[PDB]
Amino acid sequence: LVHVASVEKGRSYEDFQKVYNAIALKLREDDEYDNYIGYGPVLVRLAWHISGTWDKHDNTGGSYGGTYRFKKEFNDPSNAGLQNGFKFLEPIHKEFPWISSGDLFSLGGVTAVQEMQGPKIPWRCGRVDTPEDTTPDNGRLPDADKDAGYVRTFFQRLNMNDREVVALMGAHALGKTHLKNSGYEGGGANNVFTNEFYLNLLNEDWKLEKNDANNEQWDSKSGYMMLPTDYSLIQDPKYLSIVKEYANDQDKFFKDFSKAFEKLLENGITFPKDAPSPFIFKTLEEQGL
Ligand code: HEM
Numbered sequence: 206l207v208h209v210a211s212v213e214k215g216r217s218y219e220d221f222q223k224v225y226n227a228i229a230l231k232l233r234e235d236d237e238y239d240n241y242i243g244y245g246p247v248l249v250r251l252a253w254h255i256s257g258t259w260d261k262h263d264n265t266g267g268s269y270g271g272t273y274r275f276k277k278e279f280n281d282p283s284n285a286g287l288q289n290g291f292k293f294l295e296p297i298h299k300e301f302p303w304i305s306s307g308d309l310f311s312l313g314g315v316t317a318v319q320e321m322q323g324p325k326i327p328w329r330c331g332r333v334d335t336p337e338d339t340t341p342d343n344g345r346l347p348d349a350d351k352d353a354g355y356v357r358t359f360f361q362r363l364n365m366n367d368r369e370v371v372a373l374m375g376a377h378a379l380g381k382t383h384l385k386n387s388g389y390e391g392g393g394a395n396n397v398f399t400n401e402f403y404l405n406l407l408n409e410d411w412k413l414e415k416n417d418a419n420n421e422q423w424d425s426k427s428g429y430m431m432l433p434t435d436y437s438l439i440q441d442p443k444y445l446s447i448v449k450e451y452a453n454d455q456d457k458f459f460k461d462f463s464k465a466f467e468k469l470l471e472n473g474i475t476f477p478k479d480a481p482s483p484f485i486f487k488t489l490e491e492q493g494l
Pocket residue numbers: 246247249250253285286347348349350356373374376377379380381382383384386387388389432434466
C-alpha cells in the first residue's frame with residue numbers, strides 16, 4: 206500500500222508559511238484555553254495521534270489520509286480531548302480550504318512546537334485526504350499503565366528505536382493530563398518546549414500514588430507527574446542512559462526530537478524524487494509579527 210505525496214496544486218513555501226502564521230497568530234490569541242496553557246500542547250498531541258496509528262507492516266493508518274476527520278477515529282477513546290485541537294484548526298481550514306487535512310493536522314503540531322520555543326521541525330506537504338473506509342480502527346495508540354518492554358515493543362510498529370522513543374517522549378514536558386480524558390490528572394501547566402521532562406524524571410522525588418480514577422501515577426511535591434510509561438524510561442537501563450543524555454544537553458535533545466518528530470509525521474508517505482525539499486517555517490517572532 207503506497208501513499209505518494211502530491212503537492213496541493215500550485216502551492217509553494219509561502220502558501221504554507223501563511224497557514225503556519227494563521228495557526229501561530231491563533232495560538233497567541235486564544236490564550237485562555239486549559240487554564241492559560243493555550244492550545245500548543247494539545248496541537249502537538251493531535252499531530253502525534255493522527256500519525257501514531259501507522260503500522261509499518263501494511264502501511265495502514267498514518268498522517269497521510271487525514272482520517273481523524275472521520276467519526277471512528279475522532280471518537281477513539283485514546284483521542285479524548287483532541288476535539289479541542291480539531292476545533293481550534295477549523296477556522297484555519299476554512300480560511301485555507303486548499304490544504305489537506307493530514308497536512309493541516311501535522312503542520313499544527315510543527316507550528317505549536319516552534320511557537321513554544323522548541324526546535325525547528327522541517328515539514329513536507331502533500332498528504333492527500335483518503336476516504337472514510339481507510340480510517341484505522343481504534344486501539345493502535347499506546348496504553349499509559351505499562352512498562353518499558355511494552356513501550357519498546359509498541360514503538361517498533363512505528364519504526365522507532367530507543368533513542369527516537371526517548372526523544373519523542375520529551376514532549377511530555379508540555380501541557381498536562383486531564384482526568385476526564387485519560388484517567389490521569391496533573392502535571393502543571395507548561396507551554397514552553399524544553400528538556401525539563403528528563404530533568405524532572407531524574408531530579409524529582411517521585412511517589413507512586415493512586416489518582417481519583419483509581420489509576421497509578423508518579424507524583425512529585427512540585428506538582429509534576431509521570432505516567433507509568435514515562436517512569437519506565439528511568440527503570441530500563443538503556444532508556445535511562447538516554448534520559449541522562451537529554452537532561453544534560455538541551456541542543457542534542459532539540460536536534461533528536463526534531464528528526465524523530467518529522468519522521469513520525471512522515472511515516473507511510475512516499476515523497477517523489479522531484480518533490481520540494483522540506484520547508485523550515487519562520488516563527489512569528491523571527492518575522493517581527
Ligand atoms: C508511550 C507513549 C505515550 C503515552 C502512553 C502517552 C499518553 C498520554 C496521556 C495519557 C496523556 C494525557 C491526555 C489527557 O488526559 O489529556 C498525554 C498527554 C500528552 N502527550 Fe502523550 N503519550 C505518549 C507519547 C507521546 C508522544 C510521542 C507525544 C508527542 C511527541 C506526546 C505528546 C503529548 C502531549 C503534548 C500531551 C499533553 C496534551 C495536553 O496538554 O492537552 N505523547 N499523553
